[PDB]
Structure formats: C-alpha cells, structure tokens
Design a protein around this ligand. Structure first.
Ligand code: FAD
Ligand code: FAD
Ligand code: FAD
Ligand code: I55
Ligand code: I55
Lengths: 480, 477, 128
C-alpha cells in the first residue's frame, strides 16, 4: 500500500504517476477540498523556467542545478497535459491557457535587480538554445501601461506558458481516479514508524491507515509532519510559509493577453505577472513574504501593491475592472533555500516539498524522480543534492547574502515606487549594512539564512530569533 | 400586508407593522443573498451631524433631511433595547460605539473639506448638540502618516455606530417574535386593478390589501410597470459602495467612530468599530446607471490607501477579511421616496442613499402611522414617492458643485502634478458639464453625483435620460 | 533669423548661404524655401497640429512626472480637443499656428488673441 499525504499539485502528480506505473498496488491520497494555505489553487500558474532566472540564482552552483531541472521539467509538460486531458472531454476545459511568455523591463524597480535579471534571462535562454527574441514593446499585444510605468524592452519566450491551476487540479484528481487511485478526504496527524520502517499514517478522524510507502507532499506542513520521528527534527531542514497573494479580475471588456506577461523576480522573490484565463477573467500575482507562522489572509499592503503594479505596469483597464477574488496560498519556503525531494533514513518514507515558487512547474519531473527512486532506480541526475535528509546547504557566502538582503530591501523602495530626497537612498544603503551584518553573526557561526528569510527574521520578535539561534546550533551539533 | 425587500428599511417597517397590528398577517419577501444590498455593506454610522455638508445646509430640502436625521438619532437607544430584548447575550451587541470623532486633514479639496468642517461645527452649535473641538494628540488609537495627519478634530457625543449584520439578525429575530412570516423569494410584479393593490420569482401569487416596497435600488423599477407611474415615481439608480472588514494587527480598535466629512461625489473615509478584533473601513460611492455587484480595483486601492495613511498605518500589515459591495438607492432628484401612492394600499420606502439605515426607525414609524390613517412625522411630506422631480438647487449651483467635486477626486488621491494643470482642468471642465446640463433638459438638472455618471455613460444612455426628463415634464407641467 | 532650436548648429552653413546670395550666387540649394519675405508657410494640416498640441499638452504631465488617478489622463485627453479645435477655427480660415505657438496663444489674453486674428487676416489680404 502507498499513502500520499497532501492533495496539492505535487501530491496528486506523484499519486497519478504511482497509480499509472504500479497497477498492482493500492495508492491512497489524503487531504481535504478546502486546501488550507494551499499554494497550488492560489497559483496562476506560469510554467516558469527562463522567467524565474535571476543573476543571483545563476551565480551559485545550487542555483544553476535548480535552473537545469526547471528546463528539464519544461520538456515534460506537453505530453503530461496530453495524458491528463486524455482522461477527460472538451467540456472539462483546457489546462493550458498560453504557450508563450513576454518578459517586460520597466523602471518601476531597482536597476541592481531588474537590469541584472533581464540580462541573466537573455543569457540563460542563449545558453540553453531556447527559442526567443527581443521584440519591440509596440509589438506586445493587449498591454496598455501608464506611460511613466511602461516597458522599454520586451522578451518573447516561445514554449514557456501557463496552466489554469484549478483545471490542472481537477484533471489530476480525474486522472488519479481513472488509474485506480483512492481519495480519502482527511488529513494525516502522524506518520508511524518502528525499527526504521514506515507502518502507515494516523488521520485526524482517529483512524489508522497501514502502508509500506508514505510520500509526504503536504506543502509548508511537510517538515513539521516528518520532524516528530526520532532524530529527524534536526536532519530534515525546516520549511516556512512563503505567503503569496494573487487576484482574479473580470476585465472591463472580457479581453485578455495571448501570452503570459511578467517581470523578472523582484524584491524578496515577489514579482508582477498576468496569466490568461478563459471566460473574460485574468490572474494577477504575486506577492511573497516568508512568515514564521502560517497566515491565511492577504494584508492591505499586499493587495494595494499587487493592484497598483498591475494597473500601471500592465493595463490601465484593470483599474475599472471587477475584482472577482483575492487568493492566498503558502509557498513552502525551505530554510536553506532548496527543495526537499526523495528518500529518508526511514525505509518507505519519501518527501516532496520546499519547492517555493516553482513546485507546480517542476511537478511532472519531481513525480517521475520519486517514482524511479521508489522502484529501485536513481531517477533524475541533478536532484541528489536536494535529498530531504541533509545538513542545511550553504549555497552563498555570508558576504553575498548581506549584499543581496540590502539590495532587495532598497528594491522594496524602487518597486513602490517611492519619491524621496536623493540623499536618502544613499543614507539607507549604508545604515542597513550594520544591522543585517550583526543579525547574521548573532544567528550562527556556520549557517546564514537566504535574504527572503533573513528579512523575516530581522523583523520577527526576539523570542523567535533566539529559537532560530537554538535550531541552527542543534543542527550544527547533529551534522558537524 | 406584504413588505417587498429584506434590507434595514423593509425589516424595520415589517417589525413595526407586526408589533402594532397583531390582527393582520405581515409577509416579508427577499433572499438571504441580499443581492446589491446596501445594509450588509454598511458599517454603519448613525450619521446626523457627521453627514452635514455646506452644500446640503444651503438648500431648504437639505435642511429638512438634516432635521429628520437629528429626530431619528433620539429613537435609536429604545429601538436597540426593543430589538436586543428578543435575543440573548450570545447574539452580540447592535451598538459598537456611542461617539464619533470627525478629522480634518489636507488629503482633499479645501472647497469641500474646509467648508464641510465649518458647516458641521455650525450645525452642532445651532442644535445645542454636545460636542467639542479637541487637540488631535488627544484622539485615541489613530496612527496616521504625518503627511496625511489631521490638524483639527471634533468629538461628537451620542453620535455612534451599529454592527449592520447584528442589526439585520436582530430585525429578522424581532419580526418572527412579533408574528411576521419570512418568505425567501423576490417579487417579480405588483398586481393592481381599479386603482387598488405580488407575483414572486418562483411563479406563485401572494394576495394582499397592503404592499410596502423597500427593495432598495430596485424599488422604482418595480412600481414603474404599473399604469402612468413610469413618469410619476422618480427613478432610483445604484450608488455602488465598497467597504472592507479588517482584522487589526493587534486585535485593537478605536473607542469611537473615526470619519472625515462627506467628500467627492458623496464618497467619504470612516472606520466603524466592531467586536472581536475586527474594524469596518469605508466607503466609496459611484452612481451606476446599471447595477454592479463587484468592487473595482480603483475603489479597493483608494479605500485602503486612505485608511492606512489618514487613520492608522497599522492597517497596512493587517489582514483583509472581506471586501463588501452594496447599492445605495440613489434617487434621480437627490431626495428619498417615503409614503403613499395614487394606488390604494401601495406604499414606498426607498431612495435613502447614504442614511436610510440611520433614519430607519423614524421612516418605519412614519409609514406605519400613514398606514393607520395618521399623518406620521411632519417634515417627511415633501418626500412623497409620487411627485415631479424636485429641483433643490439652481443649474448654476450644480455646475459649480460637479466641477469642484471632479477637482476633489484629484486632491483626495492625492495627486502630484504641475501647478498649472489644476487651473487648466478647472476651466476646461466647465464647458462640457454646462453643455451636458443644457442638452439633458430645459427644466431638470441631475445632482452632481448623478451628472458625472451621465457625463461618462454611453450616448444611448444619455439620449434615454433626455427622453425620460421630457416625458416627466409632459406628465407634471 | 527664426532658427528656433538650431541656428547655432546651422550658423556656418547659413552664413555661407547669405554671403553667396550677397555676391550674386545661389548659395545652398534647399534654403530658397525659407526666403524671409513670404506668405506664412502651412507645413501641416490643422488636423495634424490639433493632434500634436493635445499630445504635447499631455506630455507636460508625463514629463513632470505627475502621479494622478488613472481615469484623469483619459478625461484631460477628451476635454482638451474641443477648446484647441475652437481656438484654431477662431484664429483664421487659412493659417494654423504650430503646436508650440498655439499653446502660447491658448493661454494669452483675449486682446492678444484678437490682435493675432487681425494679423492673420491682414497677411491673407496681402498674399491671396
Ligand atoms: C501566490 C502564489 C503564486 C504561485 N504562482 C506560481 C506560478 O506562477 N508558477 C508555478 O509554477 N507555481 C506557482 N506557485 C506554486 C509553487 O510552485 C509552489 O511551490 C507549489 O504550488 C507547491 O505545491 P505543493 O503541492 O507542494 O503544495 P500545496 O499546493 O500547498 O499542497 C499541499 C496540500 O496539502 C494539504 N495538507 C496540509 N496539511 C496536510 C495534512 N496533514 N494531510 C493532508 N493534506 C494536508 C494542504 O491543505 C494543501 O492543499 C504559486 C504559489 C502561490 C502561493
Ligand atoms: C458602502 C455602504 C456604506 C453605508 N454606510 C452607511 C452608514 O454609515 N450609515 C447609514 O445610515 N447607512 C449606510 N449605508 C446604507 C444607506 O443608509 C442605505 O440608504 C440603506 O441601507 C438602504 O436600505 P434599504 O433597505 O432601502 O436597501 P437595501 O439595504 O439594499 O435592502 C433592499 C433589499 O431588497 C432586496 N431586493 C431587491 N429586489 C427584490 C425583489 N424583487 N424582491 C425582494 N427583495 C428584493 C435586495 O436584495 C436587498 O437585500 C451604507 C451603504 C453602503 C452600500
Ligand atoms: C536655452 C537655449 C539652448 C540652446 N541650445 C542650443 C543647442 O544646443 N544647439 C543649437 O544649435 N542652438 C541652441 N540654441 C540656440 C539656437 O540655435 C538659436 O536659434 C540661435 O542661437 C539664434 O542665434 P541668433 O544669432 O539668431 O540670436 P541671438 O543669439 O539671440 O543673438 C541676437 C543678438 O542681437 C541682439 N540684438 C537685439 N536687438 C538688437 C538691435 N536692435 N541691434 C543690435 N543687436 C540687437 C541681442 O541682444 C542678441 O545678443 C539654444 C538656445 C537657447 C535659448
Ligand atoms: N467617487 C466616484 C467617482 O470618482 N466617479 C468617477 C467620475 O464620474 C469620473 O472621474 C472623475 N475623477 O471625475 C469618471 C471618469 O470615467 O469615473 C468615475 N469613477 C468611476 N467610474 C467607474 C465605474 O463605476 C466602474 N468602475 C469603477 O471603478 C468606477 N470609477
Ligand atoms: N516582499 C516581502 C517584504 O516586503 N517583506 C518586508 C520586509 O521584510 C521589511 O520591509 C522592507 N521594505 O524591507 C519589513 C519591515 O517591517 O516588512 C516586510 N513586509 C511585510 N511583512 C508583513 C507580515 O508578513 C504580515 N503582513 C504584511 O503585510 C507583511 N508585509
């Protein structure tokens, strides 16, 4: 018996692949229709590979590996969609909402992020021999930006598209049932193991389900679930909530763009994008804040920032358009900045989590990897470094991270965009360095949190900082 | 008796009929969805002095409305007592605050905010109402952006707020307790023959000798299908309003209502306290010629930007619980439709725009008195539902007002632009609005709120209004 | 004279041209069109100039750069067309001032506008 814990894109994708390739075994998938804190239903979603490229990512070994996997994942999507739509009919709707992406460069951000990241995207496309061209901004269809927020350069990426995350989830559920999978709409409370082997899963209704294989894909809750097992509290890297806000808008005239429209990734892994939808709706996203506790609701600030960027940088017509829904989901944000994919020291215990911005995009590849491992294979080459049971990765020097966190902090100003006296940005640059350098030194002699998490720690309570100093120390004692 | 509509007005008249006429069967129509419903989107402020504008208190019709609002205030303490009496502790409190603080900041037009602050101060003095101008440093809770902060503040005693949701629950409960029957369907058609008085949307027919229409923004469209009444009952449009429920960062809230005076096109900024670490913020206002059930991006951003800068920066990091949308019933001549009709047994209670909820106890008592052969409340005769369009202001006053309010949308943003531009816009707005007013009718001028909506509507919708205004002139002159 | 933005750049060429003319030559070919003694040139249609003056007026906003509600630029675009069209029609049946001069005339005194109507009329009588 196989139990998949979690009903997001990752859980359902691995569920579909297990059910399809092992018709002998019973595969049961846990999780409720509410999908509380669920990243997948809040996603547009972009099949982000080249669009996700930053200069900072492609300057670390670990970042170049992640990029390579995203490129590999892209190649699986056409046949993966075909195989999921094959179990349905025309009236179930299309999973694919666009084939192509246009990356826009405007001046509503930091030159140190947006200029560097546009160049890095262009470079990464050239390296991978991906079909693309720099196009005239006047040739980008549909957009009607505020002239003071308009793009002056535009990049057409061919075969980098989007899916309707809701139709994708429905198609995965349908495809899972078609292949003999059983959906049990309850949550796992506890994984039971003895003598270093999985026995099964206690559910929140009090029942016990036995299994020789348990795959944890419970998004941001995945580590908290596995860490209760002996020793594993300091052997599985913590996952926090990368709380993301997006919106569904009914456009003034029912129109939408033919392509994804996006900027490169911005301050603290935020970014602006519009994903086309059917029936006169568009998806706009997406904010990102690492929160030490989960949060199920958008802030005022997140809503205003998302709406202000979309109306000025993409289409002024969105200003008079109707707000259908504000969506909130938790990107699983791993403490060392890299996913938790594969095997555990406990036999039969697998983990598929900590995918942050691009779990959905990588889902077909990550599912195939874990199934290969479960069948005694080696799966996909580059995914070994992202073993779920590991010492915290140090992908960057403390120096690189301190430069990055100050740059991203300054970027929150330029992205607003602020208006202030010209002396003030220079003052803030110099006065931000000291406090972040002091925090990094106080937290650990060995581990440095990535920028996204460091800013969250900087503005957390003293108790939460002290708890992190203890965590980092306990992890050092376990591994060094 | 059939009451058509399940807003504050319908339920308030329903409760008062059921309580004072135990002999008769009173049935109230309307669904739990409350589509386009103003009441559930309301904070709501018991607005009397807070609603005072210089423009309102310069017309005879405006000074009457104000007087009624002052009268309505006196009924609220016993009205709440009598509604809470039919429930228990666990149903929650209707009243959320006793007092209001009016704030004056510079995030708006001097021609509205300075004039309206002075008019509020004056109206409080005239009515001998308890109030004082207080130091801004003594206003509790507020944490504005210094560049958006108030420099003057006005404490109004006994001007407070209710939870509109607990009020609706208490009205429904009190209606059932007094023998009322709730039928959760919508009226499709009022049936009358030989000048005497409902077909429901499920196909059924309900007989009655009394029909009270309190269907908010749908009230006139429902009565206008009857013979002649299309040009005898003033049109009601949708004053679409956006508000929000926010869970505050620390669970705190202010002890008083916090508000500005009314702003461009009857918009305004206010925070109404709620129980359980929530606050209400509102409220936008746009007259729409067709109904709209969803907030625009612009409305949401404007409401949130004003609240975070002018009231409390802590709201910026606070969680958005809900964006609310309701339709203020916006009468074409700017005044309510309350009382009797030329059809026997047909009553109307609508077109209350910003303050139907506040006036509900008084308006309910008025219509019940009229239904029992009484005269009700003195000042409400001018607001007969069957009337020629009122002309409360000269065309000249309205053209000055619409240009001033248009400019105010800029100062309220607040915009930053070259100093020559506001002077250019002032002069280039006058011609087009003067041309529209002249084209629409020789006799009727729409109030500013509706004139801007007509200005930016389609040519077909403008032409239809020219026909309507002409047909109303032929009916009455 | 009348070199506006680029007399300084063109000075060596313009000097050589006038000296050639003074010495009985033809100077530089393309400069005959710009004889000082002439009827007012009409290099653009009234339509082109009215589009240009509204566009340039809006540009003064974006160049500031302003920050204002997104409805406002669309309102100003439509409400600027009428007044500039009215001014152009009132000034002359034949001549249209270029955009740079039209905005100056738009925001001048009524007396100065009337004086320009007389000037344009007197020029028409001299050359038609
Ligand atoms: C605002 C936003 C925008 C995004 N945009 C994109 C995008 O453009 N492109 C892209 O590729 N991806 C996007 N993502 C998603 C990103 O790729 C995520 O990393 C990915 O969705 C993670 O998938 P998951 O299945 O691990 O997590 P989730 O979607 O969180 O799924 C986990 C599920 O398990 C359930 N669960 C929790 N606890 C238990 C339990 N104990 N037992 C059982 N079930 C449990 C949860 O309720 C949830 O439904 C976006 C996410 C957000 C929030
Ligand atoms: C954003 C906002 C803020 C406000 N703030 C305040 C405030 O601070 N103070 C204040 O005093 N008031 C406030 N109001 C409300 C104002 O006073 C309104 O004038 C008042 O609520 C109108 O009440 P009503 O019963 O006439 O209409 P509604 O509250 O709209 O009730 C009418 C009901 O009739 C129903 N209906 C429609 N068609 C039919 C049909 N055919 N059959 C049956 N039922 C039907 C509708 O669904 C609706 O539920 C606010 C309103 C809004 C939108
Ligand atoms: C801010 C600015 C920036 C410019 N930048 C450039 C540029 O980058 N490139 C470029 O090519 N050009 C530039 N120009 C100038 C442009 O090329 C002009 O067309 C050119 O300078 C005109 O030269 P002029 O000799 O006709 O006039 P002027 O330079 O005005 O000289 C005329 C002179 O005659 C004098 N005068 C007036 N009345 C009498 C009289 N009765 N008797 C005697 N003398 C009299 C005046 O006092 C003056 O000194 C710029 C001009 C300005 C104002
Ligand atoms: N407080 C009311 C107000 O400002 N009225 C505006 C006013 O009439 C004109 O603009 C100014 N500034 O004078 C006008 C120019 O189109 O737009 C108005 N506003 C609108 N109309 C839109 C539709 O109802 C649908 N979606 C929205 O978001 C609404 N916003
Ligand atoms: N793109 C992420 C980001 O900007 N992070 C911030 C960042 O760490 C600091 O701000 C800058 N500008 O550097 C910091 C100073 O307090 O506030 C951050 N913003 C937040 N944290 C709030 C909580 O999650 C709950 N409610 C919100 O609305 C969130 N907004």
């Amino acid at each position: 018996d196989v139990i998949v814990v979690g009903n997001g894109v990752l859980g359902l994708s691995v569920g579909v692949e297990i059910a399809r390739t092992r018709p002998d075994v019973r595969v049961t998938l846990l999780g409720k229709p509410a999908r509380q804190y669920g990243a997948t239903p809040a996603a547009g979603a972009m099949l982000g590979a080249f669009g996700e490229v930053t200069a900072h990512a492609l300057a670390s070994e670990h970042g170049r590996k992640k990029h390579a996997l995203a490129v590999q994942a892209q190649r699986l999507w056409p046949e993966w969609i075909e195989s999921l739509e094959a179990t349905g009919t025309a009236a179930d709707g299309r999973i694919k909402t666009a084939d192509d992406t246009v990356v826009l460069l405007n001046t509503v951000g930091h030159s140190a992020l947006d200029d560097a990241n546009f160049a890095a995207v262009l470079t990464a496309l050239k390296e991978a021999n991906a079909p693309h061209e720099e196009i005239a901004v006047e040739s980008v269809d549909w957009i009607d930006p505020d002239p003071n927020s308009r793009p002056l350069r535009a990049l057409h990426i061919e075969g980098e598209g989007s899916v309707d995350s809701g139709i994708l989830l429905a198609a995965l559920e349908r495809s899972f049932l078609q292949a003999g999978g059983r959906l049990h709409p309850v949550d796992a409370t506890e994984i039971r193991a003895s003598h270093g082997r999985v026995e099964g899963v206690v559910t929140d209704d009090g029942d016990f389900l036995p299994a020789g294989h348990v795959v944890v894909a419970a998004g941001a809750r995945s580590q908290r679930l596995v860490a209760a097992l002996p020793g594993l509290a300091h052997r599985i890297p913590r996952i926090y909530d990368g709380v993301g806000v997006s919106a569904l808008v009914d456009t003034w005239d029912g129109s939408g763009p033919a392509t994804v429209l996006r900027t490169s990734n911005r301050a603290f892994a935020c970014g602006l994008h519009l994903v086309p939808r059917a029936g006169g709706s568009v998806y706009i996203g997406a904010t990102n804040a690492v929160c030490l506790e989960p949060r199920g609701a958008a802030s005022i600030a997140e809503t205003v920032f998302l709406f202000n960027c979309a109306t000025h940088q993409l289409h002024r017509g969105l200003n008079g358009s109707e707000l259908r829904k504000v969506q909130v989901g938790s990107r699983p944000a791993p403490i060392d900045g890299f996913p938790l994919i594969g095997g555990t020291s406990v036999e039969g215990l697998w983990m598929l989590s900590g995918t942050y911005r691009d779990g959905l995009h990588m889902s077909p590849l990550l599912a195939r990897h874990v199934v290969s491992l479960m069948d005694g294979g080696t799966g996909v080459d580059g995914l070994r470094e992202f073993r779920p049971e590991r010492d915290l990765i140090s992908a960057w020097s403390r120096e690189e991270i301190l430069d990055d966190v100050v740059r991203h902090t300054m970027a929150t100003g330029y992205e607003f965009p602020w208006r202030l006296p010209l002396e003030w940005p220079h003052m803030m640059e110099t006065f931000l360095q000291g406090p972040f350098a002091e925090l990094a030194d106080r937290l650990s002699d060995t581990y440095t949190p990535p920028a996204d998490l460091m800013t969250a720690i900087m503005f957390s309570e003293r108790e939460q900082q002290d708890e992190l100093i203890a965590y980092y120390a306990d992890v050092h004692r376990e591994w060094h």
